[PDB]
């Protein structure tokens, strides 16, 4: 018999195809309380949902929630939030790519509420041909101040 078990890994883990390895609980000889150590070999690019496989277990790789990237197959999207001001006058933040490198983001021109920037070959690797990566997309999400004061309104001209 085969039972499904979910295995939350991280985008970074899947990216490098790390030899993630953990122990899982089961029964044993004549009813018991065990914990057996298993070894999973991830592969650069593995998409969640993939599965690698006494008793029998069916493992389904699962993408943990990354604090900066939202994945799209082979593409990676990063949503850089922006203060109202820096949304029309410019900004000079800095972001960390999926592989540790830090990337300088910067404008001196207003940016459209959902305007994006695509960086080729800077996303997750492609499972089939891994020597190829998808690409990073950085989305600017401008933040509006709630109710605005008198000066504010008057100024808007």
């Amino acid at each position: 018999e085969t039972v499904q078990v979910n295995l939350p890994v991280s985008l970074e883990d899947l990216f490098v195809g790390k030899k993630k390895s953990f122990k899982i609980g089961r029964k044993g000889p004549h009813g018991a309380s065990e914990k057996t150590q298993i070894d999973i070999q991830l592969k650069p690019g593995w998409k969640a949902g993939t599965k690698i496989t006494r008793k029998t277990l069916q493992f389904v790789i699962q993408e943990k929630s990354h604090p900066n990237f939202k994945r799209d197959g082979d593409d990676l999207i990063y949503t850089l939030p922006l203060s109202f001001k820096e949304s029309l006058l410019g900004f000079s933040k800095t972001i960390q790519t999926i592989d540790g490198r830090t990337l300088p983001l910067s404008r001196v021109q207003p940016v459209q509420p959902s305007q994006t920037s695509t960086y080729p070959g800077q996303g997750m690797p492609t499972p089939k041909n891994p020597s190829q990566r998808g690409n990073l997309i950085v989305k600017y999400k401008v933040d509006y101040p709630i109710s605005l004061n008198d000066a504010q309104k008057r100024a808007i001209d």
Partner: peptide
């Protein structure tokens, strides 16, 4: 529901 244990 088994017991997942990372490593």
């Amino acid at each position: 529901p088994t017991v997942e244990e990372v490593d």
